[PDB]
């Protein structure tokens, strides 16, 4: 009988049951979407979008609903923290319900197509055999794709008839769903320009409509029909898998590097923002500006929004996780409660010292303090006996400006060391580790998990593409080579042109 | 709710093992 790895090949020449299987798959996927959303709603804490946003909480589909304009709950909260909202039907809950209803409807249609498989539509009128005209199907579906792509850009994203999409400022502080006007100039190709996403969908949708029309009306050339085995549905599977792994690599990269469609309030910061001290520079920029207009140190740092300080912390760097460290980021370092304030270290000679920050590569990192010029002036020694730069010897103190510890100074070495241990991670936060029994070890964000999954699936779908492409082009020898293949065809020099028996010498 | 954590595996196995037994018997009945 069929081996186990071939059971679904019974659909290859059965368009109705192929449709049924595709309907069942579509039902399963829509069912997952609704199920996942309901689980996330049941677990999501909406009470602090500043220090406990969705991406700290292990939310995976919540950000995709928010991205396209679903921001509120029937319960009355919104992800932007506004209260008393009335979202109407298209709340998180309504989106989840719609997907569950859709799943149920697809399941019923799957049953009907499975039973009533022998539809005359699937029969070639000449020959009576099951046949699909794939060239024309492609034009039809492409035309539909183009129509939907265009409408999505022209109506949903512009706000002409729709909500817009998530946009934010460059530091991820003031995000909201806004209508977006297309950018038609060369900056529309800038991954960070939201208006490019609008123009893409308008222009590509028109191209898809036009290409679709072409493909409905113009038959494939003979040379191409034969070359690509366009009578064989498995050639479509081969090229479709190829397109899909291409797409999966792109979304993996834009998730990892960041773009206008992977905003940091929905997915968390990128590792590169830690690498480049992106948020630290903006924090420093603002403090220097407060100071040069006459503010106290306390005043300048107290004006730093906690949301900005929280980005400048390695615990939110997606490259600090582990494969089997499961769950939300909160399970590791805890639920952030409050910024403790900006720690300023000085030695006994009043010089300001700087903790060298942990790079993402390092699970552990030593505590080294430098002066403004990079000169080592204090550390926590490993071997004590020849220690030169101990906190005890250098008289290191720590003072806090802003936050919960504002205006406090600490001088006992064990306490100062304790904050320097935390300063390698960036800005210092007070965490609740008891609520979730947090174990203290960093986890990655939805940005990390999504990238991982999609890069891995893309790579595996490359093998699928090779496998099914091979099967398409070598269909004639799938079961073995010709028993009557003679040595003349594979020995050298018999034919001038390899495999062409008409070029015999 | 502070439920018994072994409750989940007890329930899952309670369903799975007997159900699998019946499915095995049914499928091999159909193929003869």
């Amino acid at each position: 009988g069929l081996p186990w790895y071939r059971v679904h090949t019974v659909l290859i020449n059965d368009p109705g049951r192929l449709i049924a299987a595709h309907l069942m798959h579509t039902a399963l996927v829509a069912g997952w979407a609704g199920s996942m959303a309901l689980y996330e709603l049941a677990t999501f804490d909406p009470s602090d979008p500043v220090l406990n946003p969705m991406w700290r909480q292990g939310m995976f589909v919540l950000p995709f609903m928010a991205r396209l304009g679903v921001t509120g709950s029937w319960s009355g909260w919104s992800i932007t923290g506004e209260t008393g909202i009335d979202p109407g039907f298209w709340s998180f809950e309504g989106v989840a319900l719609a997907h569950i209803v859709l799943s149920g409807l697809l399941f019923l249609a799957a049953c009907w197509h499975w039973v009533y498989w022998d539809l005359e539509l699937f029969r070639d009128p000449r020959t009576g055999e099951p046949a699909l005209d794939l060239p024309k199907m492609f034009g039809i579906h492409l035309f539909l794709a183009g129509l939907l792509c265009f409408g999505f850009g022209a109506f949903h994203l512009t706000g002409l008839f729709g909500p817009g999409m998530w946009v934010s400022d460059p530091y991820g502080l003031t995000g909201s769903v806004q209508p977006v006007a297309p950018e038609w100039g060369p900056d529309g190709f800038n991954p960070y320009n939201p208006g490019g996403v609008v123009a893409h969908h308008i222009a590509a949708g028109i191209v898809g409509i036009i290409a679709g029309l072409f493909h409905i009306l113009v038959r494939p050339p003979q040379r191409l029909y034969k070359a690509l085995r366009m009578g064989n549905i498995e050639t479509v599977l081969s090229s479709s898998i190829a397109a899909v792994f291409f797409a999966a690599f792109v979304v993996a990269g834009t998730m990892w590097y960041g773009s206008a469609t992977t905003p940091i309030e929905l997915f968390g910061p990128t590792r590169y923002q830690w690498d480049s001290s992106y948020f630290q520079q903006e924090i420093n920029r603002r403090v220097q500006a407060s100071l040069a207009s006459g503010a106290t140190l306390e005043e300048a740092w107290s004006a730093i929004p906690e949301k900005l300080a929280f980005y400048d912390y390695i615990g939110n760097n997606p490259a600090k996780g582990g494969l089997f460290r499961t769950g939300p980021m909160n399970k590791g370092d805890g639920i952030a409660q409050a910024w403790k304030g900006h720690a300023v270290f000085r030695n006994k000679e009043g010089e300001e010292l700087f903790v060298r920050r942990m790079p993402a590569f390092f699970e552990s990192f030593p505590v080294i303090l430098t002066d403004k010029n990079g000169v080592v002036k204090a550390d926590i020694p490993f071997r004590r006996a020849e220690s030169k730069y101990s906190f005890e010897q250098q008289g290191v103190t720590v003072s806090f400006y802003g936050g919960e510890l504002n205006g406090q100074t600490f001088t006992d070495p064990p306490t100062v060391k304790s904050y320097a241990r935390k300063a390698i991670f960036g800005e210092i936060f007070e965490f609740d580790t008891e609520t979730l029994n947090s174990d203290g070890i960093f986890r990655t964000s939805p940005r990390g998990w999504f990238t991982f999954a999609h890069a891995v699936f893309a790579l595996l779908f490359f093998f699928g593409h090779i496998w099914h492409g091979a099967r398409t082009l070598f269909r004639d020898v799938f079961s073995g080579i010709d028993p009557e293949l003679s040595p003349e065809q594979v020995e050298w020099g018999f034919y001038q042109k390899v495999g062409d028996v008409t070029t015999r010498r | 709710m502070e439920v018994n954590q072994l409750g989940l595996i007890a329930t899952a196995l309670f369903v799975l093992v007997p159900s699998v037994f019946l499915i095995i018997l049914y499928v091999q009945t159909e193929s003869q």
Partner: peptide, 30 residues
Amino acid sequence: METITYVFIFACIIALFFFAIFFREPPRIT
């Protein structure tokens, strides 16, 4: 987890109803 478990079991039963009714072994006269 316990809510999910109860709903899962209930959902399986509803599915079983569907198959038991529409994919029963048809009773045949003979």
